[PDB]
Amino acid sequence: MATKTSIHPSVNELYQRLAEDQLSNCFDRFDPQEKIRCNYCELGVSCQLCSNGPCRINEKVGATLGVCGINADGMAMRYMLLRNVMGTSTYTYHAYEAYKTLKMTALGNTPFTITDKDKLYQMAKDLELNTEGKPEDVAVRLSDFLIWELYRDYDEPGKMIEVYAPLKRKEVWRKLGIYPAGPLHELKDAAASCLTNVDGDYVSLATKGLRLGLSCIYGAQIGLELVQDILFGTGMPHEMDVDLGIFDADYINIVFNGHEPFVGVALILAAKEAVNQDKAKAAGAKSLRIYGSIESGQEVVQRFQKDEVFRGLTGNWLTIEPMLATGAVDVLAMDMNCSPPNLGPLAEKYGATLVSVSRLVRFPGIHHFLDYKPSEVREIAQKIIDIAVDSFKNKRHGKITPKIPANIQKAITGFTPEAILKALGGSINPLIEVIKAGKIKGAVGLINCTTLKNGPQDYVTVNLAKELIKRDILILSGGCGNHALEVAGLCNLDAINLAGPGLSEVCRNLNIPPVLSFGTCTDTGRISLVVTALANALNVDTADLPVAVTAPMYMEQKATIDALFALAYGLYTHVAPDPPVMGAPNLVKLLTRDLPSITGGRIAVGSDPVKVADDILAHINDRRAKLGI
Amino acid sequence: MATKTSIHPSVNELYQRLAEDQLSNCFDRFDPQEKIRCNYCELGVSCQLCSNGPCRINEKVGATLGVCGINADGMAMRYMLLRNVMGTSTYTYHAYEAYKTLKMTALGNTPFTITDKDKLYQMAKDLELNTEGKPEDVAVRLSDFLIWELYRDYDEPGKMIEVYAPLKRKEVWRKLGIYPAGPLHELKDAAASCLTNVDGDYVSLATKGLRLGLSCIYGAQIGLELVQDILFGTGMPHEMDVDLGIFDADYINIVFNGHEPFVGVALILAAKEAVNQDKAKAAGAKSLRIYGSIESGQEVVQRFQKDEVFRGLTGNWLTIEPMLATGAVDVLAMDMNCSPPNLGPLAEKYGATLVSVSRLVRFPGIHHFLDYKPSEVREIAQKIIDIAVDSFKNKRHGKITPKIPANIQKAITGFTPEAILKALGGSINPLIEVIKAGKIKGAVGLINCTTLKNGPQDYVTVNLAKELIKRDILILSGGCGNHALEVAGLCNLDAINLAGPGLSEVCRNLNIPPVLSFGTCTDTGRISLVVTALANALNVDTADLPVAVTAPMYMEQKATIDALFALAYGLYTHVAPDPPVMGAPNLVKLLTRDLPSITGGRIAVGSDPVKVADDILAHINDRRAKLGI
Ligand code: SF4
Ligand code: SF4
Ligand code: SF3
Ligand code: SF3
Ligand code: FES
């Protein structure tokens, strides 16, 4: 058997159960699509945007342009821009909900509280907001200000970008005309540009993609993550359990899955109530447990300890179907992507109950719809617990055979800029010195999804990471790719043994792993805070630093909006598999060859871990040479 | 070469010039695309939204679902929703600019004024705004209120929908859960829903499309059109010259082209200054003239007279390339779609200068970029005039041979709800009387683009309109399909004699044409005002009225968002060519067969003018029978 599966043994074991049970699954669905792949679509040179189409670029038959007159470069970049409107929209949606959650929390309407009050007041001071009165007054003002940043138009100056972006970058952005409006206007402008017979200029469309990336980081991501820190605490390093062996079939098991952590936190709070533990015991369970899945799970493991109630992180999105095949899940509560749309029949077979907790998430076979509102989350969480108790009794316990793989790995989660500074003794200077001395050649932000396109689940990501650390490159990781490295064991102290001589020495001295878990793809803005701090300490631009970004198994456009940001931010940005652009030669030249003279960044490509790592190291060494280190 | 050109002789004559000059053009580019059309994309059963793709549904080879698990129905409806985010974004963009233009006008920083003060105060009263102070003060309050409608979230009640929608519709919408947020939030939510592994439920995606259509009409279109009336007057019927014979090569000819009329109005005002006419004459021209193209042109002909400076409307978007081939254009000033992206080589061959006046519009070979801001529009208009004088002197005069077809048609433009009531003597009741009597069987809103997919330019639109009026169906027209009917002579008093027995009789008595020019696709909201007036007068729901909508040569998603609106509004909605959904059998059943029991509306299909007209008339007659008429 030649099926492309996973690098993880636990997933491979569970794939065997899905196959034995004759259930459809991503791994098996890949090859039928392989058999009929469209080469025009693979290369970005098809278009379906209007009724004169569908169109294809084929010069042999005189189809050099679409009916409307657009060329291959415009066609490919326009569809890229459109798909990235979707990515920006998800981050904007999440930010808005975070800000309404903070406001409603301050008004007393949620089960949450103001946890990191120091961050609240420091952020309010940095943004020149009134800090008089009660903390709850300050939190309302901050929420309203951050909503204003979402809504601000292209002609109203932002404050977040001024506080959180370095001047040398801001100067480049002003020169290029890519200082963004708020993300709601920028995503509306980008979408309008993609309508037929509007923007057909690949350079303009690329520039609009860069603007869109900047609007997403400064106008949505940084604010939402800092607000989530205010609500739930700023992460510090701690030990977490990951992989699918964390499940135990004799407990009531509720799994929260998506990118927004509000329902998951409410569930943990509710499950800690004795009345709910007593319900679980009365139903025949040992107790009631909450688990995190994908990015909502990662948000929680960044800030919360493993305890008797919250048990850790299952894995990334290609683990969801396998997870159901454990026969251990009572409720899967889904808040955003990835919630794959054929989970219904798997939930039926394995005796799990599916609950959507967002109006965004719908697909056949969901059992309950409990759309999130801050003022209702207490009641939503309690309803989910009651559903899970009923499901355990009626569907699963003693009825479904559990087949839980034994694998559990330890990961140190919760790295944040604040945690890095604390490990270094309170300033970034020791890190600068070990980079100057060459103990650490540079650093990579691995900000990534997972996919099957360019290998078994997580194969490229894990092996690239191993090649990078062997070359004395420190990794800061976020996204599904971060979950991969955690499950693969690269985020614990044992992994120091796999790093090169300089990085192993630094890691042992600081007592940190060679891969630092920074959380989600939504934490790209937060990772930029570290890179900005490095540039400022060295008195250089971000494009001058010995760093790079990689999204080596990208899937959806949250990852590519983060890649567009990285390009605007001046960075060498590796992306695999190839985005659908390679049939557009002038667009390829722009992104891979000309952008260094425009933003300083560039796209890099490829899926061979050694070659990709060597190409990243060569970039890092070029930057080092120009710095004289 | 082209197998399909146009029903308009002027366009056919100019196509011959393009072909003899061997310049690329839409007519010729259709044929190569025809040769290689993808059957998957034609049917809506391909997907390019993530890296596990591209995917196709082909059950014969085992590809029943995408890699992610989505089915054909979800796949097709999701791409339809995404494309309609683009449509909604364009209307939202335009509305926001209209509101900022009214506010900046009230503050004294534009060359515009407050023309319809009655409408300003009536709107303010209906929306319960403060009406104290000067008219300018009220205009600022109205502008801010309508911006609030754009921004309103899914959880804050709107006022426009309460004022402008009829009673039973509002009950239906609340029951279905489709009462919308503001269009900015609805379009962001729709886009986020389309990301991989979010919403894969065709019924949910269709419902989201209905909500999005409602948000577009009540949250953007009605406000923007009424604000444009406040700025530039409420249209009343007047005779207008149309078709390409309106050009004269001896004048400096500036053509404005797009959907937003602000630059066009400022150009007309500037061209009336003697300093600019004197400049034109000193350059060797007889004087300086302004002309409207496509929807921006139509907005102006609705509200402005033909005079020595403003000369009328050229035609719809398939006329732009032919227009350049006249060799009579000095500047083509482009503000939105449709600005086809291969005009560059045509402008070069025929001695015209291309100017973009919107940050949305970019494509190769544009000469100048003058992005619109209300406070800069006076300067932008003057710069365009200066560019046009230099272009006439240095590119066109004495260098380019003009070839202007002789064809000029007369059309009565400027019908509005107000003009209809006026024509009836002040009340809608005389129109109800003739409908009840059976002289007018019903009314059709023809809200359409043009395309080459289902015939030569405008063939289906014009012949369908002729067949409808022959069946005693009054037409209210907006969009590129309105421009087609004007050019074909259906909008003047001679066209009365093309109508059937009852409609010709009524039109003769009222001295109106049988096709009433209501403007643009942006005027779908305004057409709903007429249909809502009929529903109220008859005290029946819109789904029970003897009306229908047709978009019979639709192209882009402004038209399909108007169709989704029509469906939500309860109407029989004919669309041709087929939208790309016909390979998704459950989605087809929903839209064509089940929606009558849900919203009251349904999609109808087909491109045969007689069959389409017969099917519309049958629906109208079914409605009539149930009303007792
Ligand atoms: S937008 Fe242009 S390239 Fe795309 S389908 Fe329409 S005519 Fe073809
Ligand atoms: S979203 Fe699903 S159907 Fe579309 S390309 Fe990705 S895997 Fe294929
Ligand atoms: Fe935030 S990273 Fe993109 S793939 Fe779906 S949850 Fe993963
Ligand atoms: Fe407003 S209708 Fe759609 S096609 Fe392009 S201008 Fe026409
Ligand atoms: S599947 Fe239609 S062009 Fe690729």
Are A215 and A88 spatial neighbours (Cβ–Cβ below 8 Å)?
Answer: yes
Q: Which of A508, A525, A527, A509 is nearest to A517 (CA)?
A: A527
Ligand 5 in contact with A41 (CB < 6 A)?
A: yes
How big is the A-B interface in CB pairs under 8 Å?
Answer: 308
Q: How far is CA B244 from the centre of its chain?
A: 20
Question: Which residue among B33, B40, B45 is best mutated to probe the pocket of ligand 5, counting the most ligand atoms within 8 A of its Cβ?
Answer: B40
Residues B546 and B571 in one domain: yes
State the Cα–Cα distance between residues A549 and A539, nearest whole angstrom.
21
The residue numbers preceding gaps of C to N over 2.5 A in chain A are: none
The C-alpha angle A516, A521, A524, rounded to 5 degrees, equals 75
Question: Sign of the CA dihedral B30, B34, B36, B40?
Answer: positive
Strands of B249-402 (E only): list them. Answer: 252-258, 288-293, 310-313, 331-334, 353-356, 368-369
Verify whether the Cβ–Cβ distance B555 to A50 is below 8 Å.
Answer: yes
**CB environment A558-597: b (16+ within 10 A), e (fewer):** bbbbbbbbbbbbbbbbbbbbbbbbebbebbbebbeeebee
Residues A209 and A256 in one domain: no
DSSP per-residue string spanning A352-408: -EEEE-STT-B-TT--EE----GGGHHHHHHHHHHHHHHHIIIIITTTSPP------
Which pair of tokens denotes residue B555?
């192209």
Is A220 a domain residue?
Answer: yes
B162 at A interface, C-beta within 8 A? no
Residues A347 and A386 in one domain: yes
Q: Three-state DSSP class for B400?
A: coil
In Å, how far is B355's CA from the nearest CA of chain A? 13
State the Cα–Cα distance between residues A253 and A241, nearest whole angstrom.
15
State yes or no: A491 annotated in a binding site: no
State the Cα–Cα distance between residues B265 and B292, nearest whole angstrom.
10
Residues B386 and B246 in one domain: yes
Verify whether the Cβ–Cβ distance B50 to A359 is below 8 Å.
Answer: no
State the Cα–Cα distance between residues A455 and B444, nearest whole angstrom.
55
Residues B376 and B448 in one domain: no
CA A337 to centroid of ligand 3, rounded, Å: 7
B56 at A interface, C-beta within 8 A? yes
The Cβ of residue B593 has, within 10 Å, a number of other Cβ atoms equal to: 11
Q: At what angle do helices A72-106 and A222-232 cross, to 10 degrees?
A: 30
Which pair of tokens denotes residue B31?
């044929």
Please give the C-alpha separations between residue A277 and each of A145, A241, A281, A332, in angstroms, as whole numbers.
40, 22, 6, 19
Give how many domains chain B has, as a whole number. 3
Residues with Cβ within 8 Å of B552's Cβ and at least 6 positions away in sequence, in order, are B446, B448, B454, B460, B461, B464, B481, B574, B575, B576, B607, B612
Residues B84 and B218 in one domain: yes
Q: Three-state DSSP class for B233?
A: coil
Are B323 and B255 spatial neighbours (Cβ–Cβ below 8 Å)?
Answer: yes
Residues A200 and A259 in one domain: no
CA B559 to centroid of ligand 2, rounded, Å: 26
Of all residues in chain B, the one with the smallest CA distance to A552 is B51
The C-alpha angle B416, B419, B420, rounded to 5 degrees, equals 90
A148 at B interface, C-beta within 8 A? no
Longest alpha-carbon distance in chain A: 73
DSSP per-residue string spanning B71-84: -HHHHHHHHHHHHH
AA identity, residue B102: L
Mutate to test the interface with B, among A47, A195, A336 (most CBs of B within 10 A): A195
Residues A325 and A387 in one domain: yes
Of A200, A232, A264, the residue that ends a domain is: A232
AA identity, residue A15: Y
Is A25 a domain residue?
Answer: no
Are A450 and A457 spatial neighbours (Cβ–Cβ below 8 Å)?
Answer: yes
Q: Which of B184, B5, B220, B1 is nearest to B99 (CA)?
A: B220
**H helix runs in B233-374, sequence order:** 262-271, 274-282, 294-303, 320-324, 343-350
Q: How many CA atoms lie within 13 A of A554 on its CB side?
A: 29
Strands of B396-437 (E only): list them. Answer: 409-413
Are B441 and B586 spatial neighbours (Cβ–Cβ below 8 Å)?
Answer: no
Which pair of tokens denotes residue B166?
């009829």
How many H-runs (helices) and E-runs (strands) does chain A carry? 26, 16
Residues in chain B: 629
State the Cα–Cα distance between residues A67 and A56, nearest whole angstrom.
10
DSSP state of B362: B
Is A15 a domain residue?
Answer: no
Is A448 a domain residue?
Answer: yes
Residues with Cβ within 8 Å of B268's Cβ and at least 6 positions away in sequence, in order, are B290, B300, B304, B309, B310
Q: Domain holding A565: CATH number?
A: 3.40.50.2030
Q: Which of A475, A414, A104, A447 is nearest to A234 (CA)?
A: A414
Are B361 and B338 spatial neighbours (Cβ–Cβ below 8 Å)?
Answer: no
Q: Which of A237, A289, A247, A293 is nearest to A268 (CA)?
A: A289
State yes or no: A507 annotated in a binding site: no
DSSP state of B579: P
Which pair of tokens denotes residue B546?
């003897």
Are B149 and B414 spatial neighbours (Cβ–Cβ below 8 Å)?
Answer: no
Are B406 and B437 spatial neighbours (Cβ–Cβ below 8 Å)?
Answer: no
State the Cα–Cα distance between residues B202 and A364, nearest whole angstrom.
9
AA identity, residue A282: A
DSSP state of B63: B
State the Cα–Cα distance between residues A200 and A77, nearest whole angstrom.
9
Is A209 a domain residue?
Answer: yes
State the Cα–Cα distance between residues B75 and B45, nearest whole angstrom.
7
Contact list in A for residue B63 (CB cut-off 8 A) is 29, 32-33, 35-36
Residue ranges around ligand 3 (CB below 6 Å): A 259, 294-295, 316-317, 337-338, 449, 479-480, 520-521, 555-556, 558-559; B 197
Q: How many CA atoms lie within 13 A of A32 on its CB side?
A: 20
Range of the domain at B452: 409-627
Peptide bond between residue B577 and the one before it cis (omega within 30 degrees of 0): yes
Question: Which residue among B41, B45, B46, B55 is best mutated to probe the pocket of ligand 2, counting the most ligand atoms within 8 A of its Cβ?
Answer: B55
Is B47 a domain residue?
Answer: no
State the Cα–Cα distance between residues A546 and A565, nearest whole angstrom.
18
Question: Sign of the CA dihedral B556, B557, B559, B560?
Answer: positive
State the Cα–Cα distance between residues A139 and A227, nearest whole angstrom.
9
Q: Bridge partners of A334? A: A257, A356
Is B29 a domain residue?
Answer: no
DSSP per-residue string spanning B141-198: HHHHHHHHHHH--TTS--SHHHHHS-HHHHHHHHHHT-----HHHHHHHHHHHHSTTS
Atom 4 in ligand 4: residue holding the nearest Cα: B449
State yes or no: B38 annotated in a binding site: yes
**Full 3-state SS string of A458-475:** CHHHHHHHHHHHHCCEEE
Q: Domain holding A78: CATH number?
A: 1.20.1270.30
Query: Counting atoms of ligand 1 from 1, which one is nearest the CA of A55?
Result: 8
Q: Bridge partners of A242? A: A313, A409
Residues with Cβ within 8 Å of B16's Cβ and at least 6 positions away in sequence, in order, are none
Cβ-nearest to A193 among B191, B193, B360: B360
Mutate to test the interface with A, among B5, B321, B363 (most CBs of A within 10 A): B363
AA identity, residue B213: G
State the Cα–Cα distance between residues A519 and A222, nearest whole angstrom.
13
Is B53 a domain residue?
Answer: no
The C-alpha angle A188, A191, A197, rounded to 5 degrees, equals 130
State yes or no: B26 annotated in a binding site: no
Q: How far is CA A333 from the centre of its chain?
A: 18
Q: How far is CA A179 from the centre of its chain?
A: 24
A145 at B interface, C-beta within 8 A? no
Which pair of tokens denotes residue B219?
């949250």
Q: Are strands B547-551 and A252-258 parallel, antiparallel or unpaired?
A: unpaired
State the Cα–Cα distance between residues A423 and B595, nearest whole angstrom.
62
DSSP per-residue string spanning A22-80: T---HHHHHHHHHTT--HHHHHT-EE-SSTT--EE-BGGGTB-S-TT---HHHHHHHHH
DSSP state of A582: T
First to last CA, chain B: 51
Residues A430 and A528 in one domain: yes
Are B345 and A182 spatial neighbours (Cβ–Cβ below 8 Å)?
Answer: no
Q: Bridge partners of A448? A: A479
Q: Bridge partners of A443? A: A474, A547
State the Cα–Cα distance between residues A387 and A377, nearest whole angstrom.
15
Are A26 and B66 spatial neighbours (Cβ–Cβ below 8 Å)?
Answer: no
C-alpha torsion A502→A503→A505→A510, nearest 10: 140
Residues B282 and B144 in one domain: no
The resolution of the experimental structure, rounded to one decimal in Å, is 1.4
Q: How far is CA A468 from the centre of its chain?
A: 20
Please give the C-alpha separations between residue B95 and each of A538, B160, B256, in angstroms, as whole numbers.
47, 14, 19
Residues A304 and A168 in one domain: no
The Cβ of residue B53 has, within 10 Å, a number of other Cβ atoms equal to: 23
AA identity, residue B466: K
Of B374, B396, B418, the residue that ends a domain is: B396
Residues B112 and B218 in one domain: yes
Verify whether the Cβ–Cβ distance A151 to B155 is below 8 Å.
Answer: no
Of B232, B256, B277, the residue that ends a domain is: B232
AA identity, residue B35: K
Question: Sign of the CA dihedral B490, B491, B497, B499?
Answer: positive
